[PDB]
Amino acid sequence: MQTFVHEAGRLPAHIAAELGSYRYRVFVEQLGWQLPSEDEKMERDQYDRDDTVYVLGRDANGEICGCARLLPTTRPYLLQEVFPHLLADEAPRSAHVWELSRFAATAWSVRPMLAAAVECAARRGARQLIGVTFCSMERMFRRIGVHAHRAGAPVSIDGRMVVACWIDIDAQTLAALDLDPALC
Ligand X SMILES: CCCCCCCC(=O)NC1=CC(=O)CCC1
DSSP string covering 159-173 = TEEEEEEEEE-SHHH
List helix spans (H) across the chain. 13-23, 78-81, 110-123, 135-144, 171-176
Q: Which residue, 100 or 122, has its beta carbon nearer to ligand MTA? A: 100
Per DSSP, what are the bridge partners of residue 86? none
Give the residue, chosen from 132, 137, 167, 176, that forms a contact with ligand MTA under the rule CB under 6 A. 132
Per DSSP, what are the bridge partners of residue 164? 132
Q: Which residue, 11 or 79, has its beta carbon nearer to ligand X? A: 79
**CA end-to-end span of the chain, whole Å?**
25
| Residue 82 touches which of ligand MTA, ligand X, none (Cβ within 5-8 Å per kind) | ligand MTA
| Residue 180 touches which of ligand MTA, ligand X, none (Cβ within 5-8 Å per kind) | none
Where do contacts with ligand MTA occur on this chain (CB under 6 A)?
33, 45-47, 78, 82, 132, 157-158, 162
Residues near ligand X (CB under 6 A) are 26, 100-104, 129-134, 136-137, 165, 167
